[PDB]
């Protein structure tokens, strides 16, 4: 129980009621430093621990696909927490009102939340701070090394973040203690889902035949389903991961991102299990570079760059290059709706958008190709960022995520990249040509599957 995982958000006066874990990013009962820390605080105070989750007003900015995935997982989570004699309360509203009122109504003694570097979570925290007088902590339960510990600043390249992160892995990569149950026991989610689906339905993604686009059987939600996906990745896909991770015709990725995004599985758990696996060397190195270095540098990016979703956060070499080509004539301009419908003149791009539309998880390789063409076929880099973020957040199961803003910023603005050869329109941003993908994998097979 390393105290470097927890820090104070606001001092206060400790009450004598239960310890409240405001769960947000880490929707799981196992392998959860925020829940474990909350339980430990409760034990020292001779009080029970309680979990609260905010069903916020912002769900209408995404789709049924993410709402159902999240809420079905929370239904499973209710059962698991109740087995530990830990009650869970699901508050309909936004956190500033709901958390403050709950703290008062339930005589909470201490408030704890998990860590997200996203603007909306920081918006939420500000309102909560103004409505409570009890101590308020946050625990990094999402990263192996706490984000504010891995580095003191924005890291401009993987190769400057990687040695700092790896220097800290011996301390922070460790097993989880078991969650001790509470000593004694202190509108349903199905109805909430019903109400939300009703409100979301007019905006549901449909084919011209009015049949829905989304296929919900590619990733079953919840902690138990996530563990099976991790186990099948290690048993069946990890050996080939190094060779096949850049081939979107092969189903050889871990497929863990939807579970990692909602915190239905701990990435620390995944890393421990992968470290212990005997697998092809090269493959384990490649996978750990993604789930450790690239995932946690995305939290580094959002945490230390307030404007992480804007042009101003790009590196200076990229801002200069993009500005110098701002007035170049674009080969094409597509509207947000033309991008959304997969109606560019590039069949590889359109197939990547159809994979996103139908499965809610675009292959990692084509996400890079996809975002870079939005830069190439939009009026400005600012508009490209707007369009890519809109589509990523609306349709990825793993979207609205530091990985997303960081991966889009890499794609369009060269964040965590270097300058490449100068081209018109896109400047020195790394280019990914259609013909280059053809030399890389079977583009025709990918197009057939998603068309």
Ligand X SMILES: *Nc1ncnc2c1ncn2[C@@H]1O[C@H](COP(=O)(O)OP(=O)(O)OC[C@@H](O)[C@@H](O)[C@@H](O)Cn2c3nc(=O)[nH]c(=O)c-3nc3cc(C)c(C)cc32)[C@@H](O)[C@H]1O
Rounded CA separation 445/384 (Å): 28
Q: Is 237 annotated as a binding-site member?
A: no
Kindly state whether residue 366 participates in binding ligand X, applying the rule CB under 6 A: no
Rounded CA separation 253/238 (Å): 8
Stretch of 102-110, 144-152, 316-324, 360-368 contacting ligand X, by CB under 6 A: 360-368
Q: Is 107 annotated as a binding-site member?
A: no
Site string for ligand X, 326-355 (x = CB under 6 A): ------------------------------
Among 78, 155, 223, 396, binds ligand X (CB under 6 A): 396
Q: Is 241 annotated as a binding-site member?
A: yes
Stretch of 12-20, 24-32, 148-156, 289-297 contacting ligand X, by CB under 6 A: 289-297
- Minimum CB separation from ligand X for residue 385, in Å? 11
- Minimum CB separation from ligand X for residue 252, in Å? 9
Rounded CA separation 9/113 (Å): 9
CB closer to ligand X out of 98 and 121: 121
Long-range CB pairs of 384-389, under 8 A, 24+ apart, other chains included: 384/412, 385/309, 385/310, 385/311, 385/409, 385/412, 385/413, 387/336, 387/339, 388/412, 389/309
The CA distances from residue 317 to 189, 369, 383, in Å, are 49, 21, 19
Those residues whose C-beta lies under 8 Å from the C-beta of residue 358, and which sit 6 or more positions away, are 213, 214, 215, 450
- Minimum CB separation from ligand X for residue 366, in Å? 9
Rounded CA separation 66/395 (Å): 8
Using alpha carbons, select from 124, 112, 143, 119 the residue that is nearest to residue 40: 112
Size, binding site for ligand X by CB under 6 A: 27
Q: Is 255 annotated as a binding-site member?
A: yes
Q: Is 367 annotated as a binding-site member?
A: yes
The backbone region for 342, taken as left when phi is positive above 0, alpha when psi lies in -120 to 50, beta otherwise, is left
CB closer to ligand X out of 261 and 269: 261
Rounded CA separation 140/105 (Å): 27
Among 392, 395, 425, 432, binds ligand X (CB under 6 A): 392
Among 49, 256, 265, 354, binds ligand X (CB under 6 A): 256
Q: What angle do CA 413, 418, 422 make, to 5 degrees?
A: 80
Among 49, 165, 368, 432, binds ligand X (CB under 6 A): 368
Main-chain dihedrals φ then ψ at residue 149, nearest 5 degrees: -95, -35
Those residues whose C-beta lies under 8 Å from the C-beta of residue 287, and which sit 6 or more positions away, are 238, 241, 242, 245, 254, 274
Kindly state whether residue 300 participates in binding ligand X, applying the rule CB under 6 A: no
CA torsion sign for 216, 219, 35, 127 is negative
Q: Which residues pair with 137 in a beta bridge?
A: 8, 112
Among 154, 403, 413, 450, binds ligand X (CB under 6 A): 403
- Minimum CB separation from ligand X for residue 88, in Å? 25
Among 129, 213, 364, 431, binds ligand X (CB under 6 A): 364
- Minimum CB separation from ligand X for residue 387, in Å? 11
Q: Which of residues 196-255 bind ligand X (CB under 6 A)?
A: 245, 253-255
Label residue 235 exposed, middle or buried (CB < 10 Å: 0-12, 13-18, 19+).
Answer: exposed
- Minimum CB separation from ligand X for residue 132, in Å? 31
Kindly state whether residue 398 participates in binding ligand X, applying the rule CB under 6 A: yes
DSSP letter for each residue of 163-220: HHHHHHHHHH--PPPPPPPPSS----HHHHHHHHHHHHGGG--B-TTS-B---TTSS-
Kindly state whether residue 399 participates in binding ligand X, applying the rule CB under 6 A: yes
Q: Which of residues 132-151 bind ligand X (CB under 6 A)?
A: none
The single-letter DSSP state of residue 59 is G
Sheet harboring 110-114: ordered strands across? 6-10, 136-139, 110-114, 19-23, 49-55, 88-92
**H/E element holding 78?**
helix 64-83
- Minimum CB separation from ligand X for residue 7, in Å? 23
Kindly state whether residue 12 participates in binding ligand X, applying the rule CB under 6 A: no
Stretch of 148-156, 177-185, 349-357, 406-414 contacting ligand X, by CB under 6 A: 406-414
Q: Is 254 annotated as a binding-site member?
A: yes
- Minimum CB separation from ligand X for residue 407, in Å? 3
**H/E element holding 362?**
none
Kindly state whether residue 261 participates in binding ligand X, applying the rule CB under 6 A: yes
The CA distances from residue 97 to 14, 23, 384, in Å, are 20, 16, 35
- Minimum CB separation from ligand X for residue 402, in Å? 8
CB closer to ligand X out of 192 and 229: 229
CB closer to ligand X out of 68 and 290: 290
CB closer to ligand X out of 295 and 428: 295
**Contacting residues toward ligand X, per CB under 6 A:** 245, 253-257, 260-261, 290-291, 294-295, 298, 364, 367-368, 371, 392, 396, 398-399, 401, 403-404, 407-408, 411
Q: Enumerate the known binding-site residues for FAD.
A: 241, 254-257, 290, 361, 367, 392, 398, 403
Q: Enumerate the known binding-site residues.
A: 241, 254-257, 290, 361, 367, 392, 398, 403
């Amino acid at each position: 129980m390393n105290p470097k995982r927890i820090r104070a958000l606001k001092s206060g006066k400790q009450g004598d009621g239960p310890v409240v874990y405001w769960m947000s990013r880490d929707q799981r009962a196992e392998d959860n430093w925020a829940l474990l820390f909350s339980r430990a605080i409760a034990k020292e105070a001779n009080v029970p621990v309680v979990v609260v989750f905010c069903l916020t007003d912002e769900f209408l900015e995404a789709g049924i696909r993410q709402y159902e995935f999240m809420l079905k997982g929370l239904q499973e989570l209710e059962v698991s927490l109740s087995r530990k004699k830990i009650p869970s309360f699901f508050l309909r509203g936004d956190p500033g009102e709901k958390i403050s009122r709950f703290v008062k109504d339930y005589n909470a003694g201490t408030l704890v939340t998990d860590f997200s570097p996203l603007r909306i979570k920081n918006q939420w925290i500000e309102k909560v701070i103004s409505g409570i007088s009890i101590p308020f902590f946050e625990v990094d339960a999402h990263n192996v090394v706490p984000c504010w510990e891995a580095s003191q600043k924005h890291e401009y390249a993987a190769h400057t973040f990687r040695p700092k992160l790896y220097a800290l892995l011996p301390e922070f990569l460790e097993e989880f203690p078991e969650l001790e149950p509470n000593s004694v026991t202190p509108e349903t989610l199905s109805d909430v889902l019903e109400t939300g689906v009703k409100a979301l339905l007019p905006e549901r993604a449909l084919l011209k035949n009015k049949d829905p686009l989304f296929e919900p059987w590619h990733f079953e939600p919840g902690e138990k389903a996530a563990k099976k996906v991790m186990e099948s990745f290690i048993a069946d896909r990890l050996d080939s991961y190094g060779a096949l991770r850049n081939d979107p015709t092969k189903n050889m990725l871990s497929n863990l991102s939807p579970y990692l995004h909602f915190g239905q599985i701990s990435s620390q758990r995944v890393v421990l299990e992968v470290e212990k696996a005997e697998s092809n060397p090269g493959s384990k190195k490649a996978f750990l570079d993604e789930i450790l270095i690239w995932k946690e540098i995305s939290d580094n990016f959002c945490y230390y760059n307030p404007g992480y979703d804007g042009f101003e956060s790009f590196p200076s070499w990229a801002k200069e290059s993009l500005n110098a080509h701002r007035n170049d004539v674009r080969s094409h301009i597509f509207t947000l709706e033309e991008f959304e419908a997969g109606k560019t003149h590039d069949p590889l791009w359109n197939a990547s958008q159809m994979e996103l539309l139908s499965t809610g998880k675009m292959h990692g390789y084509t996400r890079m190709y996809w975002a870079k063409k939005i830069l190439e076929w939009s009026e400005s880099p600012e508009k490209a960022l707007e369009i890519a973020i809109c589509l990523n957040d609306r349709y990825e199961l793993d979207g609205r995520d530091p990985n997303g803003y960081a991966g889009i910023a890499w794609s369009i603005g060269g964040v965590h990249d270097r300058a490449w050869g100068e081209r018109e329109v896109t400047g020195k941003i790394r280019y990914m040509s259609y013909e280059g993908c053809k030399r890389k994998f079977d583009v025709k097979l990918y197009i057939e599957k998603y068309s």
